[PDB]
Amino acid sequence: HHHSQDPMSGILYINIYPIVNYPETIKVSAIPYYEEFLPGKWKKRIGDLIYLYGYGIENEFDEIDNSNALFGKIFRKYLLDILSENIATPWQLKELGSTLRLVKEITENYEFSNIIKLQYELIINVHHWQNTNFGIIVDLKINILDRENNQRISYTKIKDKYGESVKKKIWVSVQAFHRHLTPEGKKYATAMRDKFNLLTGLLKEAFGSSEDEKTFSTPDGEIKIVFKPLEIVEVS
Amino acid sequence: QDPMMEYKIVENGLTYRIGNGASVPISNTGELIKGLRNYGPYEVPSLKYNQIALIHNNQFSSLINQLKSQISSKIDEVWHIHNINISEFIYDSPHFDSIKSQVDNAIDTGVDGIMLVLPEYNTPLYYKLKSYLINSIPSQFMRYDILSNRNLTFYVDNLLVQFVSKLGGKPWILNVDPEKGSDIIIGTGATRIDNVNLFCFAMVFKKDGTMLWNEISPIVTSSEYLTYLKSTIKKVVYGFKKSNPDWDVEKLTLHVSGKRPKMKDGETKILKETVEELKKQEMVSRDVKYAILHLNETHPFWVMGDPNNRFHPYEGTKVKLSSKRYLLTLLQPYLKRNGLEMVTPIKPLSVEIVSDNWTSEEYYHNVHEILDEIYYLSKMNWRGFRSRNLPVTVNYPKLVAGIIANVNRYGGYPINPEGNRSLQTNPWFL
DNA sequence: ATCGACCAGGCTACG
DNA sequence: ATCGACCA
Ligand SMILES: [Mg+2]
């Protein structure tokens, strides 16, 4: 496998979580593009070739390494496909393509939680730097849903349907659950640090990891994700 | 050189130039207001009539007298605009026809600008009135219902920054080394206003932050994007060049922004064609060195910094995401008198270099010169005293887009921009 | 926009 | 519209 050593006081942190171990060679097998093709797991269109990988491999295949430029093009999608088979409850898959999206209903108490539904949404991409360095970029959105409808409701229509008072408190609650503001709607001293702890916490829960690292399984080999934000150093 | 997923900080010391040869530090509103009131703005606007019209529906209102009071004193004491009188025009009813009558009545008396008060938050009425005034006279709008529970002292002195700029004045400019940076920076691109329609913009800036010329395309569909993007950019350079014939542009930078059709390869093609055509036409130097950058405030990245800086990175931090993409920290928690402020988490700006005609030896040196310049331009904002988490080359087009999209959505007057010189050289969008 | 802003000294506001 | 932010 590939081991990423020290991937990257005056230290900065970014919402990129490194895959320090991954298979240095993967099985890939290409077929000509056809216009009826529709995107899905274990295949990726590149130009007029359709590359199959992972569980899409069956009999006839080539083996390509991290030195080939094709490795990063495929491993960026093949990574997300693997992570999509490793979602832990109560998180559910919402969308999978070039981006992986997971959702959970927020069950912590908040006023007006009998009419307005709230759901963390982890937005997961893959970052590819150096030539052999990969990591998952995770962002966090919060979706506001009318519980009657399970359907998205904007800040405008909540005031219309339920009153301005309701909307105000729902906004403050979303900012509190984002850790952008206090539950009392006030700016505080550790907002950015608490936001990063929330990302790291929701990410470790979404993929059923109790610990700093966790290993996932691919047909080519095992990947290992370190659930600590990447460090950025000042240049020498 | 330039190691990746490391960070370098812009060398600090950037200052404003406020007039009487005086320089105040950035990120210090108290020093700037003290300096303005001792030395004036960088350029007091020269006015025709020395007369400002205030239009409202509140006859003999005390708050209107306090407002007119704060305006009159601060326009003289902070901005050094002397001997200004404020004539009041009362409109009988809060509808467009009634208000337009008083507007037109104010134009006929001879005024340099119109300060209009409206009762509530009426988006269609506001934009129908704003689009009308934009085509006629510098204007500044206010809401009566909100200035009731505001401290009118902060409300007015912040409000006057953009109004002085609309009258042609120059509150402050950046102090920049003349040996570094671009001769002009062109903020260009397009913004979707509907699901199907959009408009192109291009805005020419000096490296000191001042806007020299600006054009917008007519509202078109995405199939016409690249054509009007090229035409819009060429017309802004035409206007820039005819108003600056003595300026040989030898280094040029394009700041491309806006939610626009996803045609990156085609867009780069057309943009490089435009520079080559401008070279042929002698609008820029025949050997101009240029670069095309993509600036996006929307992206999934967050950067956490020093616990002594609200866990935020410092101003001017340049994180290298990959070989040609960077994250720039434009804004940070700022020292006030009794300590550091509390902030909601601040997102950096994504910067991607898409094209250049530099040699390999000067590449990394030039990249960090225009990255520094992007941070510098994020300190130019005449919309108020508080800083904007955007470079001016992206902030001002966004302000233009907000007016264009809403006027088109709610039925206001067409801007007719190419014909009017004032609209091309004044920040009517503030 | 859900909220409050900016000077040195010191009428702790205003400038 | 005081301004300052901010999914796609
Ligand atoms: Mg304005």
Numbering used by the authors:
A (entry chain C): -6 to 1, 18 to 245
B (entry chain A): -2 to 427
Show sentences the authors wrote.
Here we focus on the prokaryotic Argonaute AfAgo from Archaeoglobus fulgidus DSM4304. Although phylogenetically classified as a long-B pAgo, AfAgo contains only MID and catalytically inactive PIWI domains, akin to short pAgos. We show that AfAgo forms a heterodimeric complex with a protein encoded upstream in the same operon, which is a structural equivalent of the N-L1-L2 domains of long pAgos. This complex, structurally equivalent to a long PAZ-less pAgo, outperforms standalone AfAgo in guide RNA-mediated target DNA binding.
Next, we obtained cryo-EM structures of the fAfAgo complex with two variants of gRNA/tDNA heteroduplexes: g30/t51 (30 nt gRNA, 51 nt tDNA, final resolution 2.83 Å) and g17/t17 (17 nt gRNA, 17 nt gDNA, resolution 3.56 Å), and a 2.5 Å crystal structure of fAfAgo bound to a 15 nt 5′-phosphorylated ssDNA oligonucleotide. The crystal structure contains fragments of two partially annealed non-self-complementary DNA oligonucleotide strands forming a short (3 bp) guide/target-like dsDNA region. Relative orientation of AfAgo and AfAgo-N proteins in the crystal structure slightly differs from that in cryo-EM structures obtained with longer gRNA/tDNA heteroduplexes (RMSD values 1.9–2.3 Å). A similar set of contacts to bases and backbone is also observed in the crystal structure of fAfAgo bound to a short DNA duplex fragment.
